[PDB]
């Protein structure tokens, strides 16, 4: 997010922000597969095992 849009798909904007969801699918192509790749779930919650 600190870059320009030419350098990265998170780049640009008048505020630093990603813009879309950062969960990307498993079959995304090289150049697209940034952020969280094929996440079953996200966030920080307790109670796993």
């Amino acid at each position: 997010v600190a870059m320009n849009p030419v350098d990265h798909p998170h780049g640009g904007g008048n505020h630093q922000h990603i813009g879309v969801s950062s969960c990307v699918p498993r079959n995304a192509v090289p150049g697209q597969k940034v952020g969280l790749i094929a996440a079953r779930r996200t966030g920080c919650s307790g109670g796993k095992r």
Partner: protein
């Protein structure tokens, strides 16, 4: 519509290759052979070193 991103540039190598100078070598078990495969073989620890 862009340039190649940082993760795309690391695969070619160049400045992204491992710094292997002054490494002691690859760490491995002893190769299985006749004598170990049928009995036991003896070694002595000569040094303990930082890699």
């Amino acid at each position: 519509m862009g340039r190649r991103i940082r993760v795309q540039r690391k695969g070619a190598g160049s400045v992204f290759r491992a710094h292997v100078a002054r490494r002691l070598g690859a760490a491995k078990l002893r190769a299985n052979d006749f004598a170990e495969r049928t009995g036991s073989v003896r070694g002595v620890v000569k040094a303990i070193l930082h890699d």
